[PDB]
Amino acid sequence: SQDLMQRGKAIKLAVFDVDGVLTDGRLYFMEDGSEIKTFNTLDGQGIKMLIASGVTTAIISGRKTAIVERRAKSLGIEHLFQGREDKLVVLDKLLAELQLGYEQVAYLGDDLPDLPVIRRVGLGMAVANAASFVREHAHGITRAQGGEGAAREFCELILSAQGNLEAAHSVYLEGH
Amino acid sequence: DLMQRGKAIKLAVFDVDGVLTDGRLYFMEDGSEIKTFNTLDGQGIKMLIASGVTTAIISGRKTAIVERRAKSLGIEHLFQGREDKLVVLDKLLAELQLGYEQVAYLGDDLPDLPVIRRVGLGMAVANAASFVREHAHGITRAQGGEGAAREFCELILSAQGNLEAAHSVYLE
Amino acid sequence: DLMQRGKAIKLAVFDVDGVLTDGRLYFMEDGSEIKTFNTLDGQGIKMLIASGVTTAIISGRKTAIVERRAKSLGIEHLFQGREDKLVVLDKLLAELQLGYEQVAYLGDDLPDLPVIRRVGLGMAVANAASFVREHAHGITRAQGGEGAAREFCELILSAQGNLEAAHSVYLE
Amino acid sequence: QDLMQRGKAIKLAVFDVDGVLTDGRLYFMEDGSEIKTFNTLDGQGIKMLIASGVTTAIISGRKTAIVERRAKSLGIEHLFQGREDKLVVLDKLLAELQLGYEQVAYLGDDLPDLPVIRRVGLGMAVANAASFVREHAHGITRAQGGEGAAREFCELILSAQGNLEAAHSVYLE
Ligand SMILES: [Cl-]
Ligand SMILES: [Cl-]
Ligand SMILES: [Cl-]
Ligand SMILES: [Cl-]
Ligand SMILES: [Mg+2]
Ligand SMILES: [Mg+2]
Ligand SMILES: [Mg+2]
Ligand SMILES: [Mg+2]
């Protein structure tokens, strides 16, 4: 896709939704009300490579849980917003602070609360399992599903657009 | 016709296991349970409620997990440990002064079938038992616990011309 | 022919992991397990029991989780931590006074094979090791943990003409 | 035949954990503790491999007692966790066992496995491996990690070494 590659070039900030994007969208509940969530190892590797390439990252979530706080910290995610349903307001405040334009922002989502952002940013993507209305209004859909490498693919699409994937791969393959 | 059946709906009822969940039962060594729901499903149920359709759950099982989940979503009527689902329904229909033709029901297995057979919009999830699928008016594309409920909700919103308005909150 | 092999069945025997579950083992840090079962399977086992076929589980692993699940389902005979499945079965058969031809067994791996090869209806689930699939009388279309046990129960009920009645309950 | 040929000389079979022995999911509870899932087909395959005289190892960049217990339950003789440089660890282990790269098989799913995968005699990826790894491995299993890929890999080695029949024989009497 000419359009996605081109949209990838200007990205300085990559924002992820949590449930449905970093997870497969399942909520595990125990009888006491505590939760379990699941993330994916390909995704963690993708996010680390993206950050190492100079792209900053953020998560904006309508829910709130220490599990997400821990995961974000482990991956080096620099900006974490939880318990925020108004995602565009949150983003606008982040961008005012970092002084970036919408065209410098990539966002990966799965559902309606992600849509006001997806519609505005430079690289607004849906995961394959995303609500179809969100799919139809995004710039691109990942092939992989959330919690199954969608976030990794998003990461690689950006690294590739910016000419940085090859360098990332050379760390692990001696021929390049 | 499915859209026609959807128009008249005033009450949408869900089974739990196999419909709000994927049918899996998780047990720890001491017998406590874990259960999985889906976020697409929650957004769908919240949008149906907002549209003015009331919702209920009827389950043969019983767990605090489901009470919490029902409350978090604003589900107005919850019946658990009830194997006789049509008797539960009849009672609720009395309280609400509704007939069968105004009830949608989303089910996955034999105990849901007496209801599915009788209501205005009786649907099975994709993973439902084949015999239930055969006797339902419709079958969702999505599987239970993987957005079959969100799909059921939108079907009803769409049928009632309320889906565009629910989307408009996010396109402004 | 499978329908023919189903007729004489008086005892139905299940492996646990990969048959009543998807083959996944969940472990927590402290070392304790979580196991997952499926609601279609439970409904299927209850109907088969109600038709007058008795049920058993033979497993090489051992956990209180499986004991509780067996009890909840009304599974009559439970053997865990058993390496030689054929030895265990021979003894149960002597005690119940049945021949191999009256036994159905559903398994997923090598330890199940000596039984599967000897009984009247020796079946593998879809996700079974291919060597076991190749030496079974039949293979369920569904995967373990995902309704393969249900499917196996319905094959017996159907072979014995009892499925139609089991369904009728839900058509009234 | 190429894979069959590489399998002949194997004396050590090494596995990544996440994405190879598991489907790659990481389960976290509120208090930080984890759950991990393994697969019973995989356990049988690994036990059969060991029984044939091929030793086994695990090299992971993560660290959890769950893996320690799983490896001990399966009889996996060598375990290294928290190890970012997988080759460095393999080299240390090979000198101890006095084995060479050509006698090693490795089953991986992501970039940190690729340098080992490129060095060894039988360097395989699972079906769900990052595609760049799949492209550079000697071979790819049909099965996905956590769903029998390890079993399929074990059986490849067993068969290559004329040992699968004997493994199956126990169950044909
Ligand atoms: Cl990770
Ligand atoms: Cl939700
Ligand atoms: Cl059940
Ligand atoms: Cl095992
Ligand atoms: Mg989401
Ligand atoms: Mg159900
Ligand atoms: Mg088994
Ligand atoms: Mg890995």
Q: Which of B51, B55, B74, B47 is nearest to B170 (CA)?
A: B47
Say if residue B53 is exposed, middle or buried (CB neighbours under 10 Å; 0-12, 13-18, 19+): buried
Domains in chain A: boundaries: 1-176
Instruction: Return the partners of chain B (3 or more C-beta pairs < 8 Å).
Output: A, C
**Whether B2 contacts B138, CB under 8 Å:** yes
* A147 close to D (CB below 8 A): yes
C24 and D36 within 8 Å at the Cβ level: the answer is no
Q: Which of D138, D135, D109 is nearest to A152 (CA)?
A: D109
Residue B65 CA to ligand 4 centre (angstroms):
30
**Distance (Å, whole) CA B85 – CA B63:** 17
B113 and C145 within 8 Å at the Cβ level: the answer is no
Exposed e or buried b per residue across B76-100, where buried means at least 16 C-beta atoms within 10 angstroms of its C-beta: ebbbbebeebbebbeebbeebebeb
Q: Starting from the CA of residue A45, give the closest ligand.
A: 1
| CATH H superfamily, domain D1-173 | HAD superfamily/HAD-like (3.40.50.1000)
In angstroms, this model's resolution equals 1.9
Neighbours of C68 (CB within 10 A): 15
Q: Starting from the CA of residue B59, give the closest ligand.
A: 6
Tokens of A104: 């410098």
Length of chain D (residues): 173
**Distance (Å, whole) CA A134 – CA A111:** 6
Q: Which of C50, C47, C26 is nearest to C36 (CA)?
A: C26
Distance from CA of D124 to the nearest CA of C (A): 20
| Substitution target from C16, C25, C113 for chain D, most D beta carbons within 10 A | C25
Exposed e or buried b per residue across B5-37, where buried means at least 16 C-beta atoms within 10 angstroms of its C-beta: bbebbbbbbbbbbbbbbbbbbbbbeeeebbbbb
Distance from CA of A17 to the nearest CA of B (A): 12
Cβ-proximal residues to D166 (8 Å cutoff; 6+ apart), any chain: D52
* D28 close to A (CB below 8 A): yes
Experimental approach was X-ray
| Substitution target from B20, B25, B117, B131 for chain C, most C beta carbons within 10 A | B25
Q: Which residues pair with residue A123 across a beta bridge?
A: A106
Which CATH class name applies to A1-176?
alpha beta
For residue B93, the number of C-alpha atoms closer than 13 Å in the C-beta half-sphere is 21
C40 and B28 within 8 Å at the Cβ level: the answer is no
3-state secondary structure of D84: coil
B65 and A116 within 8 Å at the Cβ level: the answer is no
Q: Which of A31, A74, A58 is nearest to B27 (CA)?
A: A31
The closest CB to that of D44, out of C29, C109, C114, belongs to C109
Distance from CA of A91 to the nearest CA of D (A): 26
3-state secondary structure of C104: strand
In this structure, whether the domain defined by C1-172 belongs to CATH 3.30.1330.80 is answered with no
Q: H helices of chain A, where?
A: 2-8, 41-52, 66-75, 87-98, 115-118, 132-136, 150-161, 165-170
Cβ-proximal residues to A31 (8 Å cutoff; 6+ apart), any chain: B32, B33, B63, B64, B65
* D73 close to C (CB below 8 A): no
| Substitution target from C36, C110, C143 for chain D, most D beta carbons within 10 A | C110
Q: Which of D122, D128, D164, D157 is nearest to D143 (CA)?
A: D128
Q: What is the DSSP letter of D65?
A: H
Q: Which of D8, D7, D12 is nearest to D100 (CA)?
A: D12
Strands A35-40 and D25-29, bridge-based pairing: antiparallel
Closest Cα in chain B to C172: B114
Q: Could you give the angle at the alpha carbon of A34 between the alpha carbons of A28 and A37, nearest 5°?
A: 40
Q: Which residues of A touch D109 (CB under 8 A)?
A: 41-42
